[model samples]
Target: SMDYQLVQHEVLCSMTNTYEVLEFLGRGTFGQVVKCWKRGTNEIVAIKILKNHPSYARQGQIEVSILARLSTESADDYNFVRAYECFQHKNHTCLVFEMLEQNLYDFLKQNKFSPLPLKYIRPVLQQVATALMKLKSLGLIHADLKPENIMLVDPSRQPYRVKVIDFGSASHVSKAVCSTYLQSRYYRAPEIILGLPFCEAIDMWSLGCVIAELFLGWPLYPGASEYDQIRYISQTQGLPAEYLLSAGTKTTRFFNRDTDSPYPLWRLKTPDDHEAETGIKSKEARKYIFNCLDDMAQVNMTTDLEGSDMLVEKADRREFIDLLKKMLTIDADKRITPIETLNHPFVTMTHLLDF
Candidate 1:
């Protein structure tokens, strides 16, 4: 994990008069984010407070540097939260950012867990793909790319504007294994779960999962643990190629030596195994059973998500499904890149022509 640290400049602790913190926003691994009023201006912003500690103070250094570099040039085009300023209050290092209404996670919850319409889904992907591509160009990998980290720049916009946030987990592409566990379990890529080295492509996998959840009104694969996460992927995408399956340092924990069998019959759960455990008797019932997003132990899954009955049949869904397959591929090497994702027909066909 990255330690939180800050750059101590002359203006470091003199921000109290410039920004007034109003309400607590949310707690993060290193600190708390709060709502604040930008003094001398009728502007409301969000302030992230890094708790005072030698360890936490060190963690903020990387995040601050990353944000500073990202904000230096063409930051407006990336469609992400803009880092306004940074300072210290009491013993805390605070970062000021543009206030966003809500996160995609909260947005989904407020909608009664209803899926987004196709029109909305298209623009969301287009925007996110463009942003991810920009990050890739800068050699940055947004390690945490889940729904909660995504914020709506302007929720009232007809197309539902959005932006990426939370850079504490972000790292340069060159630093592939900077952190042990970087992504959220539900949105984690197979490489990360299998203890293999990863890069920006992991963010693409996360984007795919987030978009699918928005369309399906629930997570595409809501795994309770690392074991369940890999199991869910295998149940849908089939086992990753044998090499990837057997290569990871921790691969043995999930896969046993199966040289005796004609095929790689590793000791793993099947779709039926899931059904037996959950009292679900059929594939159709698994849809409703698995839609329980609040908990994952009771969450169920079918043999395949793209072919599952959980997806509401609709027109023009073929292209969207095709795009998702490219993103959610089992092998990270074979997974779609952000540039390719931008060129995908699903993104090209959308109404987003510019940042």
Candidate 2:
């Protein structure tokens, strides 16, 4: 794990007459994020407090530097809460941000009891993908792309608008594996869950899962633990034979049935397994989930990682399914690159095109 340390800079304990503090936003094992307002614009913003304990300071340095170098020029415009400024304090580092009401994790839990609509699903997905491609283009990997890290940039926009936030778990593309990957349980990519090395493509896996969440109003793999997460995938989706079931080879990290009698795909998707991976036992609910899967299949497109985006061709649904599968593939080197993800069908839709 990356330690949270700060470089030397002027320390500030309090804001001047220019800013007003609001209620706290949320806190994690390491830091706290709060809401604040600028005196003149009276614009509400979120401030990340990065020094709840001693160990957190090191990672904070990498976090701020990576974001400063990678955050976009119109970062605030695309439904993402933009980082405005940063400074040091006696014991902490303060990152000022554009304020968002609350995060999707809390929002979903609040309304997990209610059914979500289709209109809401497509748009938010478009923004998330757009932002993701942008980040990956800059060579940054957002290891944490969970609901709690997602924010509604404009509270007034309602269901259709959202912006990806919380880059504390982000980093630049490099050979070293500093910190283990981070994301909520249900949203984790198999690579991270299995303790494999990873890169930006992991974000696409989370993106695919979120779209699944949007349509179902529930997580497809809502595992309470890492083992549970894998078991759910194995039992319902039919665990890929750890031993070359996909390729007729030996499975390394995950358990493989005897190579010759490796678990069959059919065995994994039994009615019982289906019921376990997804709660919907009813025919209609199952059909709806299958349809969502069909749509999801069209979203993750693949391409040559080193190829230029300008030369990339568009990808259809099967291409998408393959792409997400590639991204979600436990093998890190095989995952789709950002430039290649631009080939997805949904991203090319007419309504999603933006300036």
Candidate 3:
């Protein structure tokens, strides 16, 4: 209770400005964000207040530096959340950012998780791909890329205009390491799971999962654990290639050498067997099938179309699926880059001109 003491309506001042806290916006592992009114400037902003602890403050500094680096240019144009300034308020690091609408996940929840049409999904992906492209150029990895981390700029006016946010877990590509603590569970890439070298491609895997959720209204891999995560991935996309498995240091944690089998050198353990060994049962029931894009399309289609309308929609879905396949490729090296994704027909809208 002592730690949770930022009072409502309290005024916090930095060297250059003062902000009066209006309300709590959100809370996270680091700390809470509050909606504030910038004094004198008459502007609304969000202030991320980090906990007054050594570790969190240390990480908060990293986030501040990263934000400063990203904000060197116009971050909004690159579809990234812009941080105006960072200051220390009573020993707590506070970051001021532009106020934005609710995140994608909250929007989906409010809509009762109904799948969005391709028309709405296209612009969101295009923007996020552009953000990733900028991060790639900087050799940075936004380790956490998910619906919750993406916010709609102004839902009513801008429609699907979104910006990527929450770079607390982000790091430079050179400092990247194999840790199960990287991306969120549903968006976790195979490279991270298998304890292999990782790069910006991990974010592409996350973007692919995000796109699928926008279409299906749920996560593509809703795993209950790390074991279940790999299980869902293997079931949908097939196991990672032999070369990846062979090189992965943590491969044995999820796979076993089955020399007698003709399929692959290593075999993924069955769900039941995993439970038997680990004594942890999967909490999620298998509701969604992810064997292929066709299956996903069939399940997500909500209306009937006739003649030319159906043909156009079919082609649109085909291109989206093709882009998703490249994004979700099991091998990070082979996974589509953000630059390549931006050039895709789906993002370029070149296919629409063909009609």
Candidate 4:
């Protein structure tokens, strides 16, 4: 029903404009993104070309509409990837977005996986929080928020300036399909793993994961599988409350009911038990990033001492950890909102001296 082939250097024409493919930017299950030159505007843009498959085409249409809706609200201010337009190119959907330099994952890799200081993490986190604030206002869920989806606007000029991108998995809160798996493994929210009713709050959980990785120089929860994902989360944050476990449709898959316990009625399965039941070993041994979330402050304190005095950096680290705790709260209902995150001492830089 659609053309699957896209030749490099070939010109793709829409009803109103044309784009000459310069090179492939990235590829995924949905399709490939290419760097293109627009004929009329004489501008370089990134074009996301969807696959010919019906499922991917359907998803692409949703992404196009979401981008259009977002652009109408406030095209450039919210730190969201700007989509100029969408058009059909030889029966395949093509979305044209403003070209960005590189994703955060690539940026981190280039830095040799060294953790970023608060100064850099703060600005980037603030912009992403702003983007999420807008998304929340529209009753939308990013459904996928990770370092890889966050891109630097122009690294050479803007330094840590970033924008949230890749909305193919996003959907309105009311339209979310609970059964469908969403978000990458590392950034996946607790509610998603537990099969509880989810909302934009899930994105906040993802934001927490993203922020942690930015500061820690590695993924906060690098789970090999969904079972391992919950396990990783439990190791740090401990298990979800009893009521949350009781309500989850997929709870039995990851947890065992403890009839005798008064507090936590559900207990997460041990790695060995999980292996016995599923025949899947935890592929990677746990690499201790930090013993727990609170320990993160200590790590920051040690690294931050190089630039600033202990007292100032300590206060900053404390606030940063406070914000992260709120973001990574196991209960989605208790997780931080985008507005609250924006107002946080860490994001607002309330403790910094006015120099």
Question: Which tens-of-lDDT digit does each residue in 1-355 have in candidate 3?
Answer: 3144878588989889999998888788778889999998878998988888878876778888899788775987899998998898887888999998899999999999998889999999999999999999999999999998999988998899998998888899888777546899899999998899999899999999999999888888888788889888888888888888887888887889888444557889877887788888866645586675556655656477887787788878888889999998998878999999999998887887855
| lDDT tens per residue, model 4, 1-355 | 2435768588988877888898877687777888998897778988888887778877887888888778775657898998887888777888888899889999999999888988889999989999999999999999889887899989999898888998888898888666568899889998888888899999999999898888888888899899988888887887888888887888888899877545656888887998999888976644555558999887634643454577777888899999999999999888899999999989878777652
Candidate 2 lDDT over 234-292, as tens digits, reads: 54445543433344211222343333444433222344555666563412222123322
lDDT of each model, Cα atoms only?
0.72, 0.58, 0.86, 0.85
Candidate that would win on TM-score = 3
The estimated TM-scores of all candidates read 0.80, 0.69, 0.95, 0.93
Positional deviation of 339 in candidate 3, in angstroms?
1.0
Q: Which numbered prediction scores highest in lDDT against the true structure? A: 3
Whole-model lDDT, candidate 1? 0.72
C-alpha-based local distance difference test score of model 3: 0.86
How far does residue 20 in candidate 1 sit from its true spot (Å)? 1.7
- Any runs in candidate 1 off by more than 4 Å, and if so which? 1-17, 157-159, 260-265, 269-315, 350-355
Residue 242, candidate 2: alpha-carbon lDDT? 47
lDDT computed for candidate 2: 0.58
Q: Which ranges in model 3 have alpha carbons more than 4 Å from their true place?
A: 260-264
lDDT of 1 by residue, 1-355 (tens): 2323332221223535575667666677777776776667898887787877766666666778888888766565778888867776666777788888888888889998887866688777887888898888888988889998888877776347778887877888766762267689889988888888788889999998988888777888787666677766776767767777666766664556567444555656454654566553323211333322223212323345474333432223656777888888878888898889888766676423321
